[PDB]
Design a binder for this molecule. Structure first.
Ligand SMILES: *C/C=C/[C@H]1O[C@@H](n2cnc3c(N)ncnc32)[C@H](O)[C@@H]1O
Ligand SMILES: *C/C=C/[C@H]1O[C@@H](n2cnc3c(N)ncnc32)[C@H](O)[C@@H]1O
Ligand SMILES: *C/C=C/[C@H]1O[C@@H](n2cnc3c(N)ncnc32)[C@H](O)[C@@H]1O
Ligand SMILES: *C/C=C/[C@H]1O[C@@H](n2cnc3c(N)ncnc32)[C@H](O)[C@@H]1O
Lengths: 343, 4, 343, 343, 343, 4, 4, 4
């Protein structure tokens, strides 16, 4: 299938096992910004669901299917590849919705639907929006969508902005300098210090932060889920040209995302920006190997290239330079192995 | 906590 | 290979990937109780290494091989299956021990050593001793051991004792009762209540505790690595009969382990008991879904049964009953997915 | 007959038996807030008593009739159905007030008075105001009241507000969880946990609490005793709409009451609010079996329905929902079997 | 029937309403001495139950029937008159004992049993053994017992002993002296002080105490349930002659009780004595109206006469004298209305 | 104490 | 608490 | 700061 050719089976097994746990469902459900905004987006756009046919891609416990039923949907096909599908079926039975919600266990790329649907709903967003590569399954599901059907969420915006965080940067060497000692119990570890530094810098930092570390207004990359194709997510090139609002040392780029539910009645936004209440997506920061000095008015230009890999994530390549001085930096990061710094 |  | 036949490939990939990270090596090396005791056991039994052939199973960065070299070993074969083997070779060269430590990359069940060894050293202990199933690889390596050869560690003692900890029980119990809400955002979750409780209490709790919570003297199960065969660890049955020294609710069984290095000069112990300084193994507690009420002087009897699984861990079965009242508690736990509670 | 048609004989027997004890009379009389406020309301409104004809409904030991005499009443008919009427007549004689206070034993619904009265005094308030159903006898006694006569107390205000109290909730939850044991002395009680939770949470909790637990400004329901008909109290519907001032878990609704003595000189208030000094009425809290999560700014709306029963109390039904999420809670409580938690 | 002829219907409705609550069952079940001793008595005498027909009088939740089922009983008929019978048969079905435990709702005096039984089990003991008058129902149940059948418990011993408690005695007048004041809010209450004293002295005191207050060895009144007739409990004359072991003021008599389960294998005792751990029966104390001075070596003789009444309790008449001085006192108490002084 |  |  |  399209999923199998895209995914190492060892990665897929560990991925769907992770989502088989009720504790993981609970963690996402207790995110009030997340769950509450999805409910409002669906209920306040009730005409997009009243007497409609709905597909729920990756329904988990089925909470979005229940919101679609609260909004008056006639039939909801809830597809889930993890063992959580068994628990969703129990909830559909116990909530007396067997006539209106049909749980289909399996991958959306491999299951069969009895009919085309009017609207697709899903939560395909990972870290930095794209992590987990679930957006491809979401777009793949458009093969079940009627010609003028809708999608909830409809569009996604990824934001990038340069930041300064001297303490976060120096922290990488503090940790790596453990190896810079000539007699650890009699052993000289110093030859591995450089490898330790490289390892820490390859890790994106999943964390929240104060918005005053940002040094320029964000740049935005938009995906229209109604138009985008699966293949458009294999290689995501995000050029940027920041006009620096503040002078200082740029230590990397910060990432966040917003999705929009564009309904017939209204548009509802779900935002993970650092100016908004914290969600379980937090924000993501990728450090530069070498910081770049920039003064206010300067321009920091470069490219963030996301290359999809078969571990359901992306290799991140960031290149940046201060145009006025020519000093440049780069970094290669593995979005699959982030550092969860928040406490 | 956070997703993944 | 013996390893491949007993391990799922998705789990083994995940496992050796985890141990390829220098940050993980640092975390273990910074445990001074662990590292200092290993060096003590090796240097103080230097006649066990002076001019001997040594096998180091799962050498990681190679620190135990360096200790064996400090003790005067003539040649040390350092086997490591993760990508850490290449970092170990870097340290061997930078420490000018290429004439004495030979890194052999691969799984110890699949490599070939050029000669038999006088002594095997390793750190095969996981959580609750048995997690990671590395003891089987350690015993498997005895095919390379000469008749009167030695093993470091030589024996392993698993201790178990009943504990009372109302706060811990209520923490896990409260988490599971999220799934009691009859109207989570207007959705009835209560049908999944029982499944949630089963999942949460399947998680062993890894952290430390004050010995005041122990309700009886520990029962100990001993594995003699010199005599045990690899297949002995497929099914581990630990019967127990506790003489309750205090009255109260028995919320589960606490586990820890000690290992002894039975050298020719002296025996050195490495202990993870709660009466001893904390190590990175901490201690492990298996909670009962429903605690047992016991009176001082009662006997708590039963069996702890560990069935080795294909995820390099064990399915744990704990059945316990208060003999004086017939009150019984049967529990299943998945050692591979624990709750790391320490902060 | 009006009384006997609405009360089961058995309950009426134990009710008037309870009030026949001098110990109980002392317990109410020692409440200085209660007794002092009544004397203040009567003495400071002496013009409502000077040379007036008074009826004291449920006079107990007669204290309120002595207050009316101190304020100058010409004649006081003190009616009391319990055996305490014998003791009241003893006090009337010993205090040399036989020319002013006439004890009439029996139920106010069954006795005969020689004349109409200018003012009625009584203490008809029970827990949550309405318990004991004595307000109906108080209103029934208006058949003896001259056209523009007064009533002391004149009006009654019931206040209700949502509260957070995890400790109280867990206290009752843990009690009910005794019936979750699968091996109590070898017996599985778990099938009865549902019935246990129902039984335990039907009990209103009578005690006092700090005002910090209230999550919204109280809603008030007013009964004007000058206008109300005794049948108005058979079915009391209290709709409510709370504007949540704090985020958190709503564990139930708290209740208290104030009564006003609206005399010709001044209005005197007797308050049982948690902001006021404690009285022997304390406060009343109805717990939800499952708390509702609410955010500050949300609206908690529903209906509190009190239906009178033949045990001189009320069946309480509380339906509440968080409007923003559709989260709903329905509860049934037995006001005559409360949990007296004060200690 | 026998029950209704001897019981006021109003007393009977409250009685069986009280035992219909799961919280009341829990209180008795949580009494470890009570529940644990009943279990041991039954299980340690397995030959009295194995393959036998058993009658459980007033089974409540059914715990004793499950113990009898644990002991190998062939068939158990569990009779219960309160609404707890519905909960008992829920447990019978839940423990897969529908084939061996038959729940018969109703009074043992009015239900029909199919077949005679080998042994009757029950917990008919109330305060000072006889309160609640359930021993008569227990004895009435012998109409279903096989000629040489057995009864569990087999015999009951009520113990009486003189005590000294100056503070308990003076405490009655301290409480009554509330009424001895000439201007309680302007009212002379003093004429009711004597009535208040009389009221307090009619109440037995249910609480525990230090055994150092007991002034002589107890005298014991024994009921053999295998021999006693129901009519033997209508008028229970307990003569006593205490050989005083201590000199001092005797303020009244303390009461407690033991029952014995006389099985074929062994005899097990359940004791509520103040020398034993506290049970939910506590102990009972009845004050004399005036204390008696006695020296060690004196004899304190008299009679405790228990007269059954229609409220499922006893009127207690105590007369006592110090033989060597002629000093005498007495009291008349209502066991239906005890004072619960414990905390 | 209280009123019941 | 106590029995009754 | 634990093993695995
Ligand atoms: C972020 C949440 C993802 C949820 O969707 C499920 N899921 C991922 N990928 C698929 C495919 N291809 N088909 C069905 N369901 C999928 C995850 O298991 C999780 O519940
Ligand atoms: C707790 C430490 C484990 C170390 O040993 C290595 N390791 C595990 N299992 C094997 C096998 N079968 N062969 C070689 N090395 C092994 C881990 O990679 C880790 O360094
Ligand atoms: C809260 C105090 C109640 C007092 O009033 C007496 N009482 C209750 N109900 C009646 C009726 N219907 N008639 C006369 N007295 C009544 C209670 O006995 C208590 O003293
Ligand atoms: C102390 C516990 C008594 C239990 O026995 C029940 N009970 C009392 N009296 C009777 C009669 N005559 N028939 C059946 N069950 C009886 C109480 O209800 C309580 O459960």
């Amino acid at each position: 299938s399209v999923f199998s050719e895209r995914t190492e089976e060892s990665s897929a097994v560990q991925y769907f096992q992770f989502y088989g746990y009720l504790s993981q469902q609970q963690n996402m459900m207790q995110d009030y910004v997340r769950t509450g905004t999805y409910q409002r987006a669906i209920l306040q756009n009730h005409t997009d669901f009243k007497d409609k046919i709905v597909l729920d891609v990756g329904c988990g416990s089925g909470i979005l299917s229940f919101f679609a039923a609260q909004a008056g949907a006639r039939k909801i096909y809830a597809v889930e590849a993890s063992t959580m599908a068994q628990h969703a079926e129990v909830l559909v039975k116990s909530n007396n919705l067997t006539d209106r919600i049909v749980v289909i266990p399996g991958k959306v790329e491999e299951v069969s639907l009895p009919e085309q649907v009017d609207i697709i709903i899903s939560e395909p967003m990972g870290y930095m929006l794209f992590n987990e590569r679930m957006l491809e399954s979401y777009l793949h599901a458009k093969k079940y969508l009627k010609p003028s059907g809708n999608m909830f969420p409809t569009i996604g915006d990824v934001h990038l902005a340069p930041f300064t965080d001297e303490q976060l940067y120096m922290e990488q060497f503090t940790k790596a300098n453990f190896w810079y000692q000539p007699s650890f119990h009699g052993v000289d570890l110093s030859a591995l210090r450089g490898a330790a530094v490289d390892e820490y810098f390859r890790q994106p930092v999943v964390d929240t932060f104060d918005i005053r570390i940002l040094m320029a207004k964000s740049v935005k990359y938009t995906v229209n889920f109604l138009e985008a194709k699966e293949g458009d997510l294999h290689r995501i090139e995000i050029p940027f040209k920041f006009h620096m609002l503040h002078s200082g040392l740029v230590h990397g780029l910060a990432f966040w995302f917003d999705v929009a539910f564009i309904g017939s009645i209204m548009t509802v936004w779900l935002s993970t920006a650092p100016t908004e209440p914290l969600t379980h997506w937090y924000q993501v920061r990728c450090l530069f190997q070498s910081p770049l000095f920039a003064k206010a008015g300067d321009t920091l230009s470069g490219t963030c290239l996301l290359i999809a890999n078969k571990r359901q994530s992306y290799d991140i390549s960031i290149v940046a330079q201060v145009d006025q001085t020519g000093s440049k930096s780069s970094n290669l990061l593995d979005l699959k192995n982030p550092f969860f710094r928040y406490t | 906590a956070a997703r993944k």
